Amino acid sequence: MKFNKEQQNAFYEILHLPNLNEEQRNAFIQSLKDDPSQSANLLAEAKKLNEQQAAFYEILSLPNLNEEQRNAFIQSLKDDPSQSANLLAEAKKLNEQQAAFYEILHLPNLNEEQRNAFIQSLKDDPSQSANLLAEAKKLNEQQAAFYEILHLPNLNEEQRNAFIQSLKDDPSQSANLLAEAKKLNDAQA
Asked: How is this protein used?
């Protein structure tokens, strides 16, 4: 009973699954050699095992996880690998939320009252992290435009004060005003 094209492809794909050690790979290959008619499920299992382990590795790559939380996720994944996907989601979720903390804490152009508002508001409900982070960034970039137009070397005071005043009036036009200031600055080198 040789292999049909389907069993041949299950064989091939199992042979090329990246995160399987040699003992797992050989076990699957010998079980496939003994009873090829299980190929399909032996593939699925070999795929499932392959992705659980991939979850492992992704947990080990998230930059804003400290090693406590990380080893908690790792050990929980060794205790029951079935739930790997749920664990992985939580691993990413917490990571991004902590990423939100980090960035918001280090935004150069927020005065510390706005920052303390963003962080406290992030501690209250972490689920809003993304929505909050953008709010921080957008706010940062807009205040950043002010000091930027303040310190462009080749501007004179009426140019500066027209851009600044126009930025004070309508901050959402920052990207335009800034982009008009820069171009004018290079115009007056």
From this structure: Important immunodiagnostic reagent because of its ability to bind the Fab and Fc fragments of a wide range of mammalian immunoglobulins.
